[PDB]
């Protein structure tokens with residue numbers, strides 16, 4: 516996260532760390548006790564058996580008492596996620612056990628099946644354990660930045676016309692760079708206590724207003740998410 520601040524430990528209890536070979540690689544959130552939403556690009560060419568999902572964390576390098584660690588029983592990547600395109604960057608992880616919900620481990624709600632994406636200017640927050648600079652600096656624990664939804668036409672022009680209808684963008688509320696960076700992927704953009712976005716991609720410099728942060732527009736995927744969950748329940 517760029518231009519953010521360390522959260523109070525366990526104050527975002529839906530946040531998940533996806534780790535490969537013991538190393539944090541992506542974010543995600545707890546949808547149901549056995550289900551985590553993350554970004555499809557995080558799993559490309561990855562041996563799933565080397566993956567773990569860590570819930571209840573603040574400092575990932577410490578074996579904290581609130582941490583609950585799970586293997587991935589099943590990865591379901593969006594059926595329309597593909598190379599040579601950036602859209603549909605979303606997946607579900609069915610965990611090999613069920614989280615015990617409590618003060619440090621809880622669920623984040625999706626937008627409603629009939630909900631629209633948030634209007635430009637809407638205040639949201641994005642959290643993660645990704646880099647805090649363009650020099651691959653690690654955070655001391657879970658970080659969060661305050662951002663605002665950016666007009667999709669303005670975002671699309673800044674991206675030289677390459678955005679699709681199921682993408683949404685943000686900007687900083689002020690003159691500082693604020694947004695996500697590498698290994699924040701799959702974390703939610705939370706607006707009004709709903710997961711309206713999922714961290715997907717940005718430009719050469721993290722948080723650069725020339726290349727606005729792009730999220731998967733989660734409301735477009737709600738029906739599919741529930742289809743997958745119901746399917747294996």
Ligand SMILES: *C[C@@](*)(O)[C@H](CCCNC(=N)N)NC(=O)[C@H](Cc1ccccc1)NC(=O)[C@@H](N)Cc1ccccc1
Pocket residue numbers: 540541554556557600601602604695696697698699700701714715716717718719720721
């Ligand atoms: C994976 C997630 O952690 C990461 C967060 C944003 C990183 N932003 C910057 N370093 N500036 N997302 C990516 O790295 C994203 C991967 C991606 C691939 C395919 C479809 C969607 C998303 N890519 C980027 O943000 C771009 N900076 C470069 C890129 C890398 C790999 C493939 C395609 C583009």
Ligand SMILES: *[C@@H]1O[C@H](CO[C@@H]2O[C@@H](C)[C@@H](O)[C@@H](O)[C@@H]2O)[C@@H](O)[C@H](O)[C@H]1NC(C)=O
Pocket residue numbers: 667668671672673674675676677678679680
């Ligand atoms: C995004 O915008 C696209 C067009 O982009 C603009 O026109 C091209 C020719 C270039 O000049 C570029 O720099 C401009 O920004 C549309 O084709 C596309 O449909 C738009 N997508 C959405 C979701 O609105």
Ligand SMILES: *[C@@H]1O[C@H](CO)[C@@H](O)[C@H](O)[C@H]1NC(C)=O
Pocket residue numbers: 564585586587611612
């Ligand atoms: C879940 O998976 C992980 C690693 O794949 C493993 O260490 C753990 O024991 C598994 N849990 C159960 C209940 O099988």
Ligand SMILES: [Cl-]
Pocket residue numbers: 547548549550613
């Ligand atoms: Cl469940």
